[PDB]
């Protein structure tokens, strides 16, 4: 559900 | 399997596989490049990370679909196929951790490279922890926490608060706190202090660095909005 | 590799792999189901088609990216990696054609199953033709044309003009004409007469069949708009 | 470029 690092 | 290909050819083919969205190929090429034994450049480290992130990302998404079906059910087929996907995911994580341990981390002396690899080590132990259920889950979690913590210590001492790898590390450690360690207050505090300290350092940046940092700051903001 | 798993378990796991968007797994499960030697139901045929369509679809997209890079360039790396992807694609096509030949088509007696498999045979020879360049391209093209033609003959004799498999077959044969056989007028004529004859048969359909047929008619219309 | 059958 939460955002980890992504491009 | 890549031992007979030139290092530079593996790197060139990794970039071609990214353009073709062939991330399994991309990861195999970068694994071969690492196994040449030379340190990786900034660009090469990014290629390694993107490849395995996309491979394991698809495995994680598939595992979550199957785990949800399995829970709704609770024949052996759903459990069997979830286990198969889970085993493949664990194999990819073990492969990445093996590359970091043999011998990327021990040869990484600069802050940028050492923090980058310790962040990866935390991430792939975090992915192992997402599927852990036996007597090794606590040690896996502590292995993730320990790698993240060492990376945080180095980044705070050696990098400005807007550095993209420092921001991405703090982002992912905060997700670890929220999702894995059952420490949502720690997750929220980390995300807020990281955002605030980066906000106060933006005035030092070029237009291009500014865009890089604020993009990751928005991910910290997205999580804070979800969590509060 | 699937010889020790029950047919029904392979089918159940194919459906789970589709939900997980694990199309390589899905195709391996359905290959195992076919190799049990029993005929396939309507639903099982659809599972087989969806799995290999998605696997080869990703390979085709990757091949086109690499072929375009290769043409812009004209080191050996781009050609080598295009060849690797191309060889893997050809292997998947050969595997599908082998399943159709051993022994799906020869045991298919009903129009729905026989047309379905002949359409598949045309499609996978079409995919082989997309990458063919040597002394076998003409025979590959004729192999696609021959399979499509036999399916068209059966569908026109045995099926109503709105039948979804008849419409999808005509759609794909018309793309074959346009893209492979360099016969754009034949492609346009086929697409138009297929659309018009289906339009005149819609009044016989239920609301649910109506939606099924008009969805594929719109693909025929999209192509006619692109081609004229 | 043209559409073949798709879901
Ligand atoms: C984990 C992580 C975090 C941030 C980046 N990133 C985003 C924009 N630039 C960068 C970066 C550039 C150069 C060195 C380190 C980071 C990132 C990029 C690639 C892989 C992981 C990343
Ligand atoms: C090639 C092709 C064409 C059409 C269908 N399709 C769409 C909607 N329903 C159907 C269908 C249902 C039952 C039997 C045959 C077709 C299609 C579906 C699956 C695979 C290929 C298809
Ligand atoms: Ca060399
Ligand atoms: Ca060093
Ligand atoms: Ca049996
Ligand atoms: Ca039969
Ligand atoms: Cl399984
Ligand atoms: Cl190659
Ligand atoms: Na579910
Ligand atoms: Na190109």
- Given a contact cutoff of 8 angstroms between Cβ atoms, the answer to whether C56 and C89 are in contact is yes
DSSP state of A5: -
CB < 8 Å from B in window 23-42 of C: 25
CB B47 within 8 A of CB B30: yes
Sign of CA dihedral C92, C96, C97, C98: positive
Q: Could you tell me if B26 and B18 are in contact, meaning their C-beta atoms sit under 8 angstroms apart?
A: yes
First to last CA, chain C: 48
How far is it, in rounded angstroms, from Cα C93 to Cα C117? Answer: 14
Query: Do chains C and A touch, with touching meaning 3 or more CB–CB pairs less than 8 Å apart?
Result: no
What is the C-alpha separation between B151 and B119, in angstroms, rounded?
6
Q: Report the candidate in B9, B13, B7 with the shortest Cα–Cα distance to residue B34.
A: B7
What is the rounded CA–CA span in Å between residue C200 and residue C44? 31
What's the per-residue H, E or C state across chain C?
CCCCCCHHHHHHHHHHHHHCCCHHHHHHHHHHHHCCCCCCCHHHHHHHHHHHHHHHHHHHHHHHHHHHHHHHHCCCHHHHHHHHHHHHHHHHHHHHHHHHHHHHHHHCCCHHHHHHHHHHHHHHHHHHHHHCCCCCHHHHHHHHHHHHHHHHHHHHHHCCCCCHHHHHHHHHHHHHHHHHCCCHHHHHHHHHHHHHHHHCCHHHCCHHHHHHHHHHHHHHHHHHHHHC
- Residue of B182, D7, B224 lying closest to C49 (CA atoms): D7
Is C2 inside a domain boundary?
no
Euclidean distance between CA atoms C177 and C193, whole angstroms: 14
Structural tokens at position B198 = 């980066």
- Biggest alpha carbon distance in chain C? 61
Answer for the pair D7, C50: CB distance below 8 angstroms, yes or no: yes
Indicate the DSSP class of residue A1: -
SS (H, E, C) chain B: CCCCCCHHHHHHHHHHHHHCCCHHHHHHHHHHHHCCCCCCCHHHHHHHHHHHHHHHHHHHHHHHHHHHHHHHHCCCHHHHHHHHHHHHHHHHHHHHHHHHHHHHHHHCCCHHHHHHHHHHHHHHHHHHHHHCCCCCHHHHHHHHHHHHHHHHHHHHHHCCCCCHHHHHHHHHHHHHHHHHCCCHHHHHHHHHHHHHHHHCCHHHCCHHHHHHHHHHHHHHHHHHHHHC
Q: Whose CA is nearest to atom 1 of ligand 2?
A: C168
At C171, list the tokens.
């759609």
Query: Residue B2 in contact with residue C84, Cβ under 8 Å?
Result: no
CB atoms under 10 Å from CB of C194, counted, come to 22
Task: Check CB contact under 8 Å for B168 and A5.
Answer: yes
- The approach used to solve this structure was X-ray
Alpha-carbon distance of C33 to C19, in angstroms, equals 18
CA distance B208 to B222: 22
| Paired tokens of C116 | 């379905």
C-alpha C183 chain-centroid distance: 20
Range of the domain at C220: 7-228
Of D1, D5, D7, the CB nearest to C172: D5
| B122 close to ligand 1 (CB < 6 Angstrom) | no
In order of B136, B178, C75, the CA distances from C221 in angstroms are 58, 50, 44
Q: Is the CB of B119 under 6 A from ligand 1?
A: yes
**CATH number of the CATH domain containing B29:** 1.20.190.20
Q: Is the CB of B164 under 6 A from ligand 1?
A: yes
Q: Give domain status of residue C51, yes or no.
A: yes
Q: Is the CB of C211 under 6 A from ligand 2?
A: no
Interface of D with C (CB under 8 A): 1-7
C-alpha distance from residue B21 to each of B7, B124, C34, C77, C205 (Å): 21, 21, 30, 17, 42
Q: How far apart are CA B39 and CA B104, in angstroms?
A: 7
Cα B119 to Cα B164: distance, rounded to the nearest angstrom:
12
Nearest CA to ligand 1 atom 13: B42
Three-state SS string over B154-180 comes to HHHHHCCCCCHHHHHHHHHHHHHHHHH
Given a contact cutoff of 8 angstroms between Cβ atoms, the answer to whether B174 and B224 are in contact is no
Q: Does D2 contact C179 at a Cβ distance shorter than 8 Å?
A: yes
Peptide bond preceding C6: is omega within 30 degrees of 0, i.e. cis?
no
Q: At what angle do helices C111-131 and C77-99 cross, to 10 degrees?
A: 160
Whether C19 is in a domain gets the answer: yes
d(CA B207, CA B189): 28
Q: Does some domain include residue B147?
A: yes
C-alpha distances out from residue B4 to B27, B48, B86, B203, C174, Å: 17, 19, 31, 49, 45
D2 SS3 class: coil
B14 near B30, Cβ under 8 Å?
A: yes
The answer to whether B179 contacts chain A (CB < 8 Å) is: yes
- Cβ contact C219–D1 (<8 Å): no
Q: Given a contact as 3+ CB pairs under 8 Å, which chains touch C? A: B, D
Name every chain C residue with its beta carbon within 8 A of the beta carbon of B65: 19-21
| Residue C1 covered by a domain | no
Contacts of C100 (CB under 8 A, 6+ apart): C117, C120, C121, C124
| Coil, helix or strand at residue D1 | coil
Residue C160: left if φ>0, alpha if ψ -120 to 50, beta else—which one? beta
- CA gap C101, B176 in Å, rounded: 52
- CB–CB contact D3 C222 (8 Å): yes
Q: How many residues in chain C?
A: 228
Q: Whose CA is nearest to atom 13 of ligand 2?
A: C42
CA angle, residues B139, B140, B145, in degrees to nearest 5:
95
Give the list of residues 6+ apart from residue B130 with CB closer than 8 angstroms, or none: B60, B63, B179, B180
Q: Report which DSSP code applies to D4.
A: -
Q: How near does any CA of chain D get to the CA of C158, in Å?
A: 21
Give contacts of C58 with chain B, Cβ < 8 Å.
21
- Is B69 within 8 Å of B78 (Cβ atoms)? yes
For tokens 């694994």, what's the residue? B31
Count how many domains chain B has.
Answer: 1
Structure tokens at B161: 């608060």
Nearest-atom number in ligand 1 for the CA of B164 is 4
Ligand 2 pocket mutation, candidates C27, C165, C213, C215, criterion most atoms within 8 A of CB: C165
Q: Give the angle B159-B162-B166 at the CA atoms, nearest 5°.
A: 55
């Amino acid at each position: 559900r939460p955002s980890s690092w992504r491009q | 399997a890549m031992g007979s290909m030139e290092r530079a050819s593996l790197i060139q083919k990794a970039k071609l596989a990214e353009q073709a969205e062939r991330y399994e190929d991309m990861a195999a090429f970068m694994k071969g490049a690492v196994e040449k034994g030379e340190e990786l450049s900034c660009e090469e480290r990014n290629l390694l990370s993107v490849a395995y992130k996309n491979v394991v990302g698809g495995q994680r998404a598939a595992w979550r679909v199957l785990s949800s079906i399995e829970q709704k059910s609770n024949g052996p087929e759903v459990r069997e196929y979830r286990e198969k996907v889970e085993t493949e995911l664990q194999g990819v994580c073990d492969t990445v951790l093996g590359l970091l341990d043999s011998h990327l981390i021990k040869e990484a002396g600069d802050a940028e490279s050492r923090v980058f690899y310790l962040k990866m080590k935390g991430d792939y132990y975090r992915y192992l922890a997402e599927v852990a259920t036996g007597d090794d889950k606590k040690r896996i979690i502590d292995s993730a926490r320990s790698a993240y913590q060492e990376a945080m210590d180095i980044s705070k001492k050696e990098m400005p608060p807007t550095n993209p790898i420092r921001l991405g590390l703090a982002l992912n450690f905060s997700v670890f706190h929220y999702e894995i360690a059952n420490s949502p207050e720690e997750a929220i505090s980390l995300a807020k202090t990281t955002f605030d300290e980066a906000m106060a350092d933006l005035h030092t940046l070029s237009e291009d660095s500014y865009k890089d940092s604020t993009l990751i700051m928005q991910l910290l903001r997205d999580n804070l909005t979800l969590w509060t």
